[PDB]
Amino acid sequence: AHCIGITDRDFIEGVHGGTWVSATLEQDKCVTVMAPDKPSLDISLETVAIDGPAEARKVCYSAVLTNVKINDKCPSTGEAHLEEENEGDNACKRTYSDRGWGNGCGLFGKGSIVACAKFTCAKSMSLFEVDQTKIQYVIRAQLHVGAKQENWNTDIKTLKFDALSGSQEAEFTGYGRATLECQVQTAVDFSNSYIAEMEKESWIVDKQWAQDLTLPWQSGSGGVWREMHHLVEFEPPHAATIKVLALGNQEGSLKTALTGAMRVTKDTNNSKLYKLHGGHVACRVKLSALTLKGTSYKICTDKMFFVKNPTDTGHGTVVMQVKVSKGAPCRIPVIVADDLTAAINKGILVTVNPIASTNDDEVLIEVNPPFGDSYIIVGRGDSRLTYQWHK
Amino acid sequence: AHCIGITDRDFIEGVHGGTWVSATLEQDKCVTVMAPDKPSLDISLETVAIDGPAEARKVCYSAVLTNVKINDKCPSTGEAHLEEENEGDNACKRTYSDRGWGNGCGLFGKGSIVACAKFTCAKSMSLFEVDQTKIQYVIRAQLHVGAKQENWNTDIKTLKFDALSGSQEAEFTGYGRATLECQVQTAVDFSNSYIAEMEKESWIVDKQWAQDLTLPWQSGSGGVWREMHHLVEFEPPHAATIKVLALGNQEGSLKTALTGAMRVTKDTNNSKLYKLHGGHVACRVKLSALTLKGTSYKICTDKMFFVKNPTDTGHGTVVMQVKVSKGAPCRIPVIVADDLTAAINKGILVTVNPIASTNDDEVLIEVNPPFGDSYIIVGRGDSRLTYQWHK
Amino acid sequence: AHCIGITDRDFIEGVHGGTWVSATLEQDKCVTVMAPDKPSLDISLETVAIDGPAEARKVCYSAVLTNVKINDKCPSTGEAHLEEENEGDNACKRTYSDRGWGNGCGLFGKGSIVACAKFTCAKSMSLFEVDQTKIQYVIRAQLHVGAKQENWNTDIKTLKFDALSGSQEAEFTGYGRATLECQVQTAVDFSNSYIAEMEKESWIVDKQWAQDLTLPWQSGSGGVWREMHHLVEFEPPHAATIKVLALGNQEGSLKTALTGAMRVTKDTNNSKLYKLHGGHVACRVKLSALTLKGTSYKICTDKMFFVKNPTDTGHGTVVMQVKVSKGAPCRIPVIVADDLTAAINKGILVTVNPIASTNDDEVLIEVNPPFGDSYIIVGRGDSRLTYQWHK
């Protein structure tokens, strides 16, 4: 079951005869819900997904400024203006200046100068409103049947939760069913946030922070740009003229500020599906309807062999694969004990009742051994498998 | 001597044998200068004026507001925008308004609204930039020839002053010449100020105040009205509509604030001459080129008449008119005394040498009497006129 | 001269027995240098420049990665390796992915990952050396000719200065000579710095600061980027996959850091010719060889008047321009009194003997009346062009 492959693994044990076991899930992590007479259930949060956000704003982070014009008025001869001031994309600025006593000047002091330049956005990030009702939480659930790793990707049941389907049944063929309830409404605070997007790149950002950006922005339906000041500088006026510059691409600064946000991956297939990293959710599992498949079966009592020897795992837990050699739809007895006399089975099975359901069935088994050295033991009689182990 | 009629008058006496006599003149006041053997001279400031100043700004004080347009978007979706936001002559405001299923929304959040309206100035104050080198000055000057009042408007000399005309000559047909050194260009007491104008009314006001004035204003050459929010008001939005209103005419409030300023009149005839009701002049007068007419004339030998009896006038001086019936090309002996049997020339003539030109010519004579009880005497011998006077 | 219009100016004045008057020049300042028996001098600094300085570095701010590839090996199976790890144009990271049966490894544990991408630069910032032996200077000066406004077109002397020489001589026709000695080599601030250049913008940057940029950089005409780390990030490995990204264009952050460095402007008539800013040169000037052209001529004392009447100006002189209608070749006197008697004087002329060479032209002249009220007087005799002034 797929939790073997995840580094952060939590074992959660149900109290005997209890029904509802709570767990908390996070995308780097998985949980193996485990209960005393029922096969263990691996559960993990695969993704949080957001479908069809609405474009609220675009924020420009580089501007190709073009077609500057300037006009000027001599001291106490009036005040200057430009036709471009009547038009919203010209980003104009107005200021006094000194002016030359040789330049038709009347008197010492200040002339007046006005300049305008056609601001156009070269690159912008898009800010999307999160359609909070649309959020899907996608859960993987997989039962410890003892399926070999090749089969995990087909055996995993995938469940999608949103507020319309807060309860779901995972049904496992022959093992019964488990009911999941997940707290989709509580787990995230996307009400006060935008998805922020850049070329091939995306983030989820605080709605205040993204409004408070000192950058020129556009109303998402494509209107005027609204605060040109944050990208256009005018060099303090020369007596005859004033000269204008665009600031550089703020992309490097803007990504620097974004580093604290949760990253988002835009899907490969959908145009407008956004998958969100690091989101988490709480769930409860009704284990009660799960059952062991083969508690009816006879004990294998026949030659067995390891297809993969018991390896360690980071979980302090041993994983092995066993094939029953012949003639037996049967349950494989597994012990781990201090002595080859196997006085007491100190270790705990995670594959709570391992079964070879048919003569070819390659059975994965997971066992949590005691600390210290001990012997894992499989099968019975003259043909036991054994393997020395250490904590 | 038109400064008989002017209400505020200063006499000034030239130092005996000083070629230049100092004087100062004010917008509705007169100096009359006397020197011990020269005919007395009236000098008066007719106007301080500026011809064709440049308009710096127009300031809207009533606006009509038309073609209101609104765009509204539900709280889930993006920022609202209008085409009108790109046009300079639209006053426009952006705000967020409560919405819900009463308005066709999906969600109950704060929707977005923008509303723009076409702004047009109905009436505006014009601000004209003064420039002290452009100030014209005009001086009215007249000798005490003793002409009747009906002749004063032709005998008054008009002297015009500007940056070039730094000194001027007045020539009086029988009485020689004087020249004025009016330092008018520095005598002014205003700077960095606008002539402020409304229909048939005008003012002069501080530049910085008129820039601080909280009203929409326009560059003198035209173009966009650029602080429209000081006349356009938006009533807070209802869920799908916002009501935008122009404020009423501000001219009462505006000229209330102007009430403390010095007044100006646009000329009754000229296109662009503005006359300023203040300022003052400093001057000096070269009197030594004046000569008393006809002192070699014979004395009146025969009967005379008062035709306007001597009267007081507020300057503390006496004015009379006398007709010469016969023997006319003669000087009229004027004496003010206090011992009628043995008269002495105790009082001081302002009409320093009165002469008749032709039979039944009527002269005017102004005389400054001594303190106390006194006689004013005109003519000689038994047919002389005599009049009682006091203080 | 032309320096009247400069935003700020300073006064230095010598006395007889003194010589070698000290001065300081700055690239947009001016000084008036004066001496009692000799014409006043205006001085200013026109350009500091360097021609074709040497390449120090290029610093990249916009990496483009391509052709990434990866090698991965199971735990306890040695170290992964890539040929790209061993050649210059590939950035690489070597690290470990946690792996197990879920990822095709036979054992559970950390297996090594290495990944490399081809690195190319879309843009980079050049750093050029301050080749201080090549630091060109150009120095501007003029004497107080008295010439009217436009003649500044070609009257101004402007002088090349260089590390090749210490001093240069002014030649004034009719006004003698002067020597300016500049210590050109040593005044500069550029102890350890580079010309930093981006496309169409440039800066003078601290050498150590520039070397200490957290950015990939290349020596001269190199073939390798001597650091590559700072623009490449690797998202932590998942199974056998690791994915590599360029950071965004740092240009905006870099210009943000460069803000507050001294500007540079490249010229266009020659490539790689750089005008600096903030240039400095402390100098001394030998005034003793200067002379006045006209001191022996007679005073004008003829029909004369203002053509640009006196005004203040921002550095504290009074400036005026005047005409004699016709007269002799003569000197125009100006004197400043505190009474119209003009026999007692206190103000200073900076044009000491302005020259009316011929009748058809004006002279532009300057004066410094004392604190408080004062009279400017130009001409003498009957042409009493009196013009009052205050502070």
Residue numbers in the entry:
A (entry chain B), B (entry chain C), C (entry chain A): 1 to 391
From the paper:
Yellow fever virus (YFV) is a re-emerging flavivirus that causes severe hepatic disease and mortality in humans. Crystallographic studies have resolved the structure of the YFV E protein and shown that its domain architecture is similar to related flaviviruses, with three N-terminal ectodomains, known as domains I (DI), II (DII) and III (DIII) and a stem anchor region known as the transmembrane domain (TM). Here we use a chimeric virus platform to resolve the first high resolution cryo-EM structures of YFV. Stark differences in particle morphology and homogeneity are observed between vaccine and virulent strains of YFV, and these are found to have significant implications on antibody recognition and neutralisation.
Exhaustive domain swap interrogation between bYFV17D and bYFVES504 revealed that DIII is a key determinant of virion icosahedral assembly and FLE mAb neutralisation. Similarly, all the chimeric virions in the bYFVES504 backbone retained their parental virus phenotype, except for bYFVES504/DIII17D, which most closely resembles the smooth phenotype of bYFV17D. Next, a cryo-EM map of bYFVES504/DIII17D was resolved to a resolution of 6.5 Å. This reconstruction displays the typical flavivirus architecture of 180 E proteins arranged in a herringbone-like pattern on the virion surface and is substantially better resolved than the bYFVES504 reconstruction. We then utilised the symmetry expanded local reconstruction method to resolve the ASU of bYFVES504/DIII17D to 3.3 Å. Similar to the bYFV17D:2C9 ASU reconstruction, M as well as the transmembrane domains of E have not been resolved. Exchange with DIII of YFV17D allowed for high resolution elucidation of the bYFVES504 virion structure in both unbound and 2C9 (E-DII mAb) bound forms, demonstrating high similarity to bYFV17D. Conversely, there was a significant increase in neutralisation of both bYFVES504/DIII17D and bYFVES504 T380R when compared with the parental bYFVES504.
